[PDB]
Design a protein around this ligand. Structure first.
Ligand SMILES: CO[C@H]1O[C@H](CO)[C@H](O)[C@H](OCc2cc3ccccc3oc2=O)[C@H]1OC(C)=O
Ligand SMILES: [Cl-]
Length: 137
């Protein structure tokens, strides 16, 4: 698939929706980003950074009216340059739940509450993207 890739989420997200992204991190990658969007707002930005001051960190945040909010940072970093990955995002009633390579990684409490209006997922960064799909569990 071509990156950046836009995956429509028809009628928005709902609890029990599972999104699966398969790809390979490029050698010498700098960043990956998943952006769940509500129009111009970003309800959930998930942003692995491979070199922030010589550390690897995952930054999560929300953008409202063009302004970024308070960051939530995770130091557990399961991505590896050059290697294949699987990201699964499970929508639960109170948070997005993220697993990488079948291991739980983090939860992100819903700040944007109109879940039915979060109707696009943007996938970008230094990856080769193999597939991006959703199903209901
Ligand atoms: C406060 O802004 C930083 O932190 C934000 C999260 O709190 C975003 O990750 C944002 O990134 C959004 C962003 C970065 C980007 C980088 C390359 C290409 C396209 C990009 O599109 C973006 O929205 C960051 O901004 C910078 C300089 O990386
Ligand atoms: Cl809202």
């Amino acid at each position: 698939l071509i990156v950046p890739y836009n995956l429509p989420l028809p009628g928005g997200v709902v609890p029990r929706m599972l999104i699966t992204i398969l790809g390979t991190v490029k050698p010498n990658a700098n960043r990956i980003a998943l952006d769940f969007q509500r129009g111009n707002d970003v309800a959930f930005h998930f942003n692995p950074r491979f070199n922030e001051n010589n550390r690897r960190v995952i930054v999560c945040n929300t953008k409202l009216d063009n302004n970024w909010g308070r960051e939530e940072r995770q130091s557990v970093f399961p991505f590896e340059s050059g290697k294949p990955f699987k990201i699964q995002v499970l929508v639960e009633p109170d948070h997005f739940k993220v697993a990488v390579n079948d291991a739980h990684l983090l939860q992100y409490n819903h700040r944007v509450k109109k879940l039915n209006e979060i109707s696009k997922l943007g996938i970008s960064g230094d990856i080769d993207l193999t597939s991006a799909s959703y199903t209901m569990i």
